Amino acid sequence: LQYNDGKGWWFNREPRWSFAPDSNGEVVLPNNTLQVLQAYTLNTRKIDITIRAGRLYSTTLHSFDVSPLVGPDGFIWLDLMLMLPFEHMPLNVLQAIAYQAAAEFIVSKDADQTKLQMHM
Amino acid sequence: QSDTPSIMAESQFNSLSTKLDAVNLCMRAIGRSGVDNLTSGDLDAEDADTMIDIVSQRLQYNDGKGWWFNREPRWSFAPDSNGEVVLPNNTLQVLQAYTLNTRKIDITIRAGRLYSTTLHSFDVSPLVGPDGFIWLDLMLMLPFEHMPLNVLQAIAYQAAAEFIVSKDADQTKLQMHMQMAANLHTGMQVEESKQNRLNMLVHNPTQRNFGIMAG
Amino acid sequence: YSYVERTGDGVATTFNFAFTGKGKGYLLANQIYVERWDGASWQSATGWSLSGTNQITFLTPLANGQVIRIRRIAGKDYPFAQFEPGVMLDMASLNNTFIHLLEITQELLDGFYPDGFYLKQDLNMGWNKIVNLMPGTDGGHAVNKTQLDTLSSHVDDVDQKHTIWNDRQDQQ
Amino acid sequence: YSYVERTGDGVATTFNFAFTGKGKGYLLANQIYVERWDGASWQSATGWSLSGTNQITFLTPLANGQVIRIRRIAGKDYPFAQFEPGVMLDMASLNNTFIHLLEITQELLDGFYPDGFYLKQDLNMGWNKIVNLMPGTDGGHAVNKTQLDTLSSHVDDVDQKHTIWNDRQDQQ
Amino acid sequence: YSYVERTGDGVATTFNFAFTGKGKGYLLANQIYVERWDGASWQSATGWSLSGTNQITFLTPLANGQVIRIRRIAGKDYPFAQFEPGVMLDMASLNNTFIHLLEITQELLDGFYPDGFYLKQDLNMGWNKIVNLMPGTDGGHAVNKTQLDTLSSHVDDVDQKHTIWNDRQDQQ
Amino acid sequence: YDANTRILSTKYGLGDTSQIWAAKVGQMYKVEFVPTDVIIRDSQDRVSYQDVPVIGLVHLNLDRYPDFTVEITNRKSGAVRVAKASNRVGGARNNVVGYVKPTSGTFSFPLRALSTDVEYRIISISPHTFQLRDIEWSGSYNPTRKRV
């Protein structure tokens, strides 16, 4: 539900980062990232970034590392969103998530039509 | 001093990434609880395993092209002196590369290695590009792992609905899963174009050509 | 232990492998991985099919003296079984889990490491030998004393032709 | 796997890491270790605090080009949990123990060796190269091809200056 | 950790050892193994016996300057305890299985390796050092800078002879 | 068990090692059970031996049971399938390592065939009691054509 349709809410999304891939090669994405995009600021060429298991990938270079895609005098800049856990949430999502999950919970276990239609 | 490190260090999100959790999720809405081990000895355990594998490339293919992670740009094969080139691992589809001064030649994929219909020769020596290793575009199949977190949720719900209709016959449970999974697919397909963004101009050959002239 | 080496020649198309452990020696069919020795590199092979419990069948017979290596790679990131309360607790998972966790260490004893591996710390061997090295091509590669003998041989010949030049110069 | 490296370039004060495993990757908050590279050897950083699920906040922004890495340290002596008579069997402890036994393996699997480590026996790599090694410093340290190239070039230098020295004498 | 270095020489016939773990620190009596170093290499000791749960006694006093080590080796191919349907789980086997799996990992943390161990793929040094290595014996062995230093010094010695024995030519 | 010396040796920890404990030893006997096939009984009390429902799941209600196995056999293909059941379920009282107390519960295994096509056999090899209370089947019934 946090990811919703495409980009998430205001508290999920995080602004531009800096990953600075090592000498070995590619850089590792932190825990769970719903989606990662390159920063779209000026004077930056559009290079495809794709996320495989954990650390990312480059389809055009076709190599697992991303060392050749380091930008001019800037290591690497991209935009991503975390998935923060159930606690430390805006209180509105807390109630919204409960009813949606409970409504689905109804029909996992037998529920009356009445209970399902109202909760949905 | 301060309390931010102390309190939220205990916080836990426990996102779903394992194949087994998808099977366990698929093992709900049906009755019995999920299996602890992928292999186990329960027949329904491997039945759910088969569903995940089958629905994998079905979903990953969309209609025609898949998402951005299935994209694989220009390849080079350089077919061996023995004969034709063998397609790497399992590929959903194969398309010809579309660079300049490249005539259209037919490429068709048989078991592994490809076939050219016009030549009718199962080996393709002469249609190699000039100093080029038959550049072409294809689409690998990633396993259940090595995929974004959202597509994992999308494939699980879609597979769960197919398991229910095969296993059980209930209108209420089936209707919800089909509707709700389709909601996630559109909610995920919307960002695919939003990612790797493309526009009318530049990309369209006739629009860019018109743009350069009279400007 | 895990890895098994095999040579192929003739019409033979079926090869048998045996791993340490109970029964078949492995938990999943996905753990089996096949490699072919091209004589220079660790190239992977294609066209192999698992026909039996502990044997594989190729589509075509191997050529003269072809070398293949059947190894077994286990899951490197998650435990085999995930335990939760309220689930059908079976004992087979416990036996499989211990074998799997024992298995992940097994190939490490053999000597396999995942790709992109480097010892980033200062290692020590406590005064033990390092043997069986090839000559290094790039400057970053280490060198055995075979190159050292060649360099020692090189300085000998240049020094000996130095001597013969002065020896005939002393005739003058 | 276990280690995540991050290079800060000005302004930035929050750095993220990702240990392998389901969910977070580390069982307890004390398992995180932060080390800083001063250009010579890895030192232990100070002032860092946990301000996220896997993001840490430094007191001051790091200097441009500074290289640090994040490690997961697990207990290497005792099992995570012990089972005794008359107690509820806890799947939470059972799951945590298996992760604990695994998480020490990725530590060893990625080459992270404890301080004061040296293998007591001769080791051979079976016709495999050693790569990415700078020139040694101590007499007991190994030497790579670059040092051999330096010495070989010097032998050429003494060879060539012998030739110029011996040739112009030959005219008299 | 697992190994204990003991230098007991003269009169004394019994030695006491402590291992990391619970209680006696070993699963079975046969795990304990003794090594004696003769000044060149390590080999199995003779005449030793296990006195009790800890500490061992030799039949004769060790010679002056003798050094021995007490190691803990455990079976690596098989899990310690295998479970069967319709039997009862006891705490001895359950705790020991984790102890055994923890024990085998610790053995690799001490640099102990089994016989017939060789790497299959080349390993990346990642810009680090090699220390305290003797000069090699066969061409397949590695080299320390001591051999390079001697070769360079030997090269210099001939170069000095090249100078002076060509110097007297100049006045001639 | 040593045959020559007719002595049983055990390495398990039975408690205090300074006392003497007593144990029961003897031969074991299998328990075999085969319930009848299920046929739909209409309200007018007439049978259709060809109109056979498709069994989806079988639920067994038990009061005291050790770990056992259920054998599935097919009269047409001849393949045999074994579903192993255990009395250990997470979060329950009978989960202590000490002893698995006799407690009630339920167990479900799939059949995946016509009722007249396969048979399921209950096999138990354990010194503990095995009490089978009720057997329930669940599945799909498609009446292609109505009964007389």
PDB file of C-alpha atoms in Angstrom, chain C residues 27-153:
ATOM      1  CA  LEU C  27      18.564 -31.032  -1.650  1.00  0.00           C
ATOM      2  CA  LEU C  28      17.428 -29.356  -4.891  1.00  0.00           C
ATOM      3  CA  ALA C  29      17.977 -30.098  -8.560  1.00  0.00           C
ATOM      4  CA  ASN C  30      18.936 -26.422  -8.945  1.00  0.00           C
ATOM      5  CA  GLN C  31      22.079 -27.083  -6.889  1.00  0.00           C
ATOM      6  CA  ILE C  32      23.666 -29.066  -9.741  1.00  0.00           C
ATOM      7  CA  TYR C  33      25.823 -26.993 -12.087  1.00  0.00           C
ATOM      8  CA  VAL C  34      27.925 -28.208 -15.007  1.00  0.00           C
ATOM      9  CA  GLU C  35      31.251 -26.833 -16.235  1.00  0.00           C
ATOM     10  CA  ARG C  36      33.462 -27.610 -19.230  1.00  0.00           C
ATOM     11  CA  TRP C  37      37.255 -27.293 -19.388  1.00  0.00           C
ATOM     12  CA  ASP C  38      38.331 -25.545 -22.591  1.00  0.00           C
ATOM     13  CA  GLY C  39      41.986 -25.787 -21.542  1.00  0.00           C
ATOM     14  CA  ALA C  40      42.280 -22.082 -20.704  1.00  0.00           C
ATOM     15  CA  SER C  41      39.227 -20.911 -18.757  1.00  0.00           C
ATOM     16  CA  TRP C  42      36.331 -21.971 -16.529  1.00  0.00           C
ATOM     17  CA  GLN C  43      33.756 -21.961 -19.319  1.00  0.00           C
ATOM     18  CA  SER C  44      30.236 -23.178 -18.606  1.00  0.00           C
ATOM     19  CA  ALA C  45      28.615 -25.946 -20.639  1.00  0.00           C
ATOM     20  CA  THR C  46      25.237 -26.292 -22.337  1.00  0.00           C
ATOM     21  CA  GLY C  47      23.264 -29.202 -23.723  1.00  0.00           C
ATOM     22  CA  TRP C  48      23.330 -31.263 -20.521  1.00  0.00           C
ATOM     23  CA  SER C  49      20.207 -32.877 -19.079  1.00  0.00           C
ATOM     24  CA  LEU C  50      19.625 -34.568 -15.719  1.00  0.00           C
ATOM     25  CA  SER C  51      18.446 -38.059 -16.677  1.00  0.00           C
ATOM     26  CA  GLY C  52      18.983 -39.966 -13.419  1.00  0.00           C
ATOM     27  CA  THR C  53      19.146 -39.293  -9.704  1.00  0.00           C
ATOM     28  CA  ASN C  54      22.959 -39.103  -9.652  1.00  0.00           C
ATOM     29  CA  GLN C  55      23.730 -39.111 -13.393  1.00  0.00           C
ATOM     30  CA  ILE C  56      23.460 -36.677 -16.298  1.00  0.00           C
ATOM     31  CA  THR C  57      23.014 -37.285 -20.025  1.00  0.00           C
ATOM     32  CA  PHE C  58      24.454 -35.181 -22.838  1.00  0.00           C
ATOM     33  CA  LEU C  59      22.857 -34.760 -26.258  1.00  0.00           C
ATOM     34  CA  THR C  60      26.074 -35.577 -28.126  1.00  0.00           C
ATOM     35  CA  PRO C  61      29.098 -37.687 -27.168  1.00  0.00           C
ATOM     36  CA  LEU C  62      32.101 -35.805 -25.831  1.00  0.00           C
ATOM     37  CA  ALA C  63      35.125 -35.353 -28.078  1.00  0.00           C
ATOM     38  CA  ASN C  64      38.622 -36.754 -27.550  1.00  0.00           C
ATOM     39  CA  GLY C  65      39.769 -36.145 -23.992  1.00  0.00           C
ATOM     40  CA  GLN C  66      37.139 -33.524 -23.194  1.00  0.00           C
ATOM     41  CA  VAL C  67      37.114 -32.571 -19.510  1.00  0.00           C
ATOM     42  CA  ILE C  68      33.962 -31.696 -17.567  1.00  0.00           C
ATOM     43  CA  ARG C  69      33.437 -30.916 -13.888  1.00  0.00           C
ATOM     44  CA  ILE C  70      30.182 -31.562 -12.029  1.00  0.00           C
ATOM     45  CA  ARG C  71      29.896 -29.409  -8.909  1.00  0.00           C
ATOM     46  CA  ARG C  72      27.056 -28.534  -6.541  1.00  0.00           C
ATOM     47  CA  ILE C  73      26.286 -24.958  -5.457  1.00  0.00           C
ATOM     48  CA  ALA C  74      23.897 -24.360  -2.560  1.00  0.00           C
ATOM     49  CA  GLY C  75      21.772 -21.350  -1.687  1.00  0.00           C
ATOM     50  CA  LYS C  76      24.132 -18.584  -0.595  1.00  0.00           C
ATOM     51  CA  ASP C  77      21.706 -16.081   0.967  1.00  0.00           C
ATOM     52  CA  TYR C  78      18.797 -17.675   2.834  1.00  0.00           C
ATOM     53  CA  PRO C  79      18.420 -20.724   5.074  1.00  0.00           C
ATOM     54  CA  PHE C  80      16.785 -23.687   3.379  1.00  0.00           C
ATOM     55  CA  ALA C  81      13.735 -23.724   5.666  1.00  0.00           C
ATOM     56  CA  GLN C  82      11.915 -20.815   7.297  1.00  0.00           C
ATOM     57  CA  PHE C  83      10.209 -21.623  10.594  1.00  0.00           C
ATOM     58  CA  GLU C  84       7.173 -19.807  11.978  1.00  0.00           C
ATOM     59  CA  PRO C  85       4.841 -20.665  14.849  1.00  0.00           C
ATOM     60  CA  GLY C  86       1.499 -22.204  13.954  1.00  0.00           C
ATOM     61  CA  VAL C  87       2.829 -24.039  10.877  1.00  0.00           C
ATOM     62  CA  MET C  88       2.851 -27.765  10.173  1.00  0.00           C
ATOM     63  CA  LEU C  89       6.112 -28.534  11.978  1.00  0.00           C
ATOM     64  CA  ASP C  90       7.781 -31.504  10.292  1.00  0.00           C
ATOM     65  CA  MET C  91      11.116 -33.026  11.272  1.00  0.00           C
ATOM     66  CA  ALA C  92      12.378 -33.497   7.688  1.00  0.00           C
ATOM     67  CA  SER C  93      12.908 -29.731   7.420  1.00  0.00           C
ATOM     68  CA  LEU C  94      15.187 -29.859  10.464  1.00  0.00           C
ATOM     69  CA  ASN C  95      17.299 -32.624   8.918  1.00  0.00           C
ATOM     70  CA  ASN C  96      17.389 -30.854   5.551  1.00  0.00           C
ATOM     71  CA  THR C  97      18.219 -27.487   7.130  1.00  0.00           C
ATOM     72  CA  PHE C  98      21.256 -28.845   8.979  1.00  0.00           C
ATOM     73  CA  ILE C  99      22.492 -30.581   5.825  1.00  0.00           C
ATOM     74  CA  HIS C 100      21.937 -27.388   3.824  1.00  0.00           C
ATOM     75  CA  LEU C 101      23.743 -25.264   6.413  1.00  0.00           C
ATOM     76  CA  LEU C 102      26.463 -27.904   6.530  1.00  0.00           C
ATOM     77  CA  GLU C 103      26.429 -27.844   2.727  1.00  0.00           C
ATOM     78  CA  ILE C 104      27.090 -24.102   2.382  1.00  0.00           C
ATOM     79  CA  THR C 105      30.346 -24.603   4.288  1.00  0.00           C
ATOM     80  CA  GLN C 106      31.249 -27.739   2.330  1.00  0.00           C
ATOM     81  CA  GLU C 107      32.421 -26.157  -0.930  1.00  0.00           C
ATOM     82  CA  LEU C 108      34.280 -23.502   1.072  1.00  0.00           C
ATOM     83  CA  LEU C 109      36.421 -26.356   2.385  1.00  0.00           C
ATOM     84  CA  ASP C 110      36.877 -27.494  -1.219  1.00  0.00           C
ATOM     85  CA  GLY C 111      38.126 -24.064  -2.316  1.00  0.00           C
ATOM     86  CA  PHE C 112      35.315 -22.398  -4.266  1.00  0.00           C
ATOM     87  CA  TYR C 113      34.497 -18.742  -3.638  1.00  0.00           C
ATOM     88  CA  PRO C 114      31.873 -16.490  -5.239  1.00  0.00           C
ATOM     89  CA  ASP C 115      32.887 -14.131  -8.017  1.00  0.00           C
ATOM     90  CA  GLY C 116      33.958 -10.619  -7.107  1.00  0.00           C
ATOM     91  CA  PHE C 117      35.918 -11.914  -4.107  1.00  0.00           C
ATOM     92  CA  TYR C 118      38.948 -10.170  -2.617  1.00  0.00           C
ATOM     93  CA  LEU C 119      40.688 -10.329   0.762  1.00  0.00           C
ATOM     94  CA  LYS C 120      40.585  -6.655   1.721  1.00  0.00           C
ATOM     95  CA  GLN C 121      42.567  -7.138   4.944  1.00  0.00           C
ATOM     96  CA  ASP C 122      46.260  -7.819   5.527  1.00  0.00           C
ATOM     97  CA  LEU C 123      46.424 -11.612   5.529  1.00  0.00           C
ATOM     98  CA  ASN C 124      49.176 -13.656   7.161  1.00  0.00           C
ATOM     99  CA  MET C 125      50.196 -17.286   6.670  1.00  0.00           C
ATOM    100  CA  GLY C 126      52.445 -17.689   9.716  1.00  0.00           C
ATOM    101  CA  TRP C 127      55.590 -18.601   7.735  1.00  0.00           C
ATOM    102  CA  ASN C 128      53.988 -21.072   5.304  1.00  0.00           C
ATOM    103  CA  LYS C 129      54.755 -21.665   1.626  1.00  0.00           C
ATOM    104  CA  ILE C 130      52.876 -20.369  -1.402  1.00  0.00           C
ATOM    105  CA  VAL C 131      53.345 -22.770  -4.315  1.00  0.00           C
ATOM    106  CA  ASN C 132      52.080 -23.617  -7.805  1.00  0.00           C
ATOM    107  CA  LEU C 133      51.930 -20.198  -9.479  1.00  0.00           C
ATOM    108  CA  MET C 134      52.070 -19.250 -13.138  1.00  0.00           C
ATOM    109  CA  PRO C 135      54.252 -16.418 -14.428  1.00  0.00           C
ATOM    110  CA  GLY C 136      52.419 -13.109 -14.204  1.00  0.00           C
ATOM    111  CA  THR C 137      51.749 -11.073 -17.332  1.00  0.00           C
ATOM    112  CA  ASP C 138      50.493  -7.756 -15.951  1.00  0.00           C
ATOM    113  CA  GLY C 139      52.414  -5.829 -13.319  1.00  0.00           C
ATOM    114  CA  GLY C 140      49.676  -6.451 -10.766  1.00  0.00           C
ATOM    115  CA  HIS C 141      50.156 -10.217 -10.919  1.00  0.00           C
ATOM    116  CA  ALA C 142      52.452 -12.048  -8.528  1.00  0.00           C
ATOM    117  CA  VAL C 143      55.576 -13.852  -9.731  1.00  0.00           C
ATOM    118  CA  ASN C 144      57.030 -17.273  -9.018  1.00  0.00           C
ATOM    119  CA  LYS C 145      60.787 -17.832  -9.073  1.00  0.00           C
ATOM    120  CA  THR C 146      60.602 -19.329 -12.567  1.00  0.00           C
ATOM    121  CA  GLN C 147      60.664 -15.728 -13.778  1.00  0.00           C
ATOM    122  CA  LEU C 148      63.326 -15.002 -11.152  1.00  0.00           C
ATOM    123  CA  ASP C 149      65.448 -17.824 -12.568  1.00  0.00           C
ATOM    124  CA  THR C 150      64.908 -16.425 -16.069  1.00  0.00           C
ATOM    125  CA  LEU C 151      65.949 -12.954 -14.906  1.00  0.00           C
ATOM    126  CA  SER C 152      68.894 -14.490 -13.046  1.00  0.00           C
ATOM    127  CA  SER C 153      69.752 -16.349 -16.248  1.00  0.00           C
TER     128      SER C 153
END
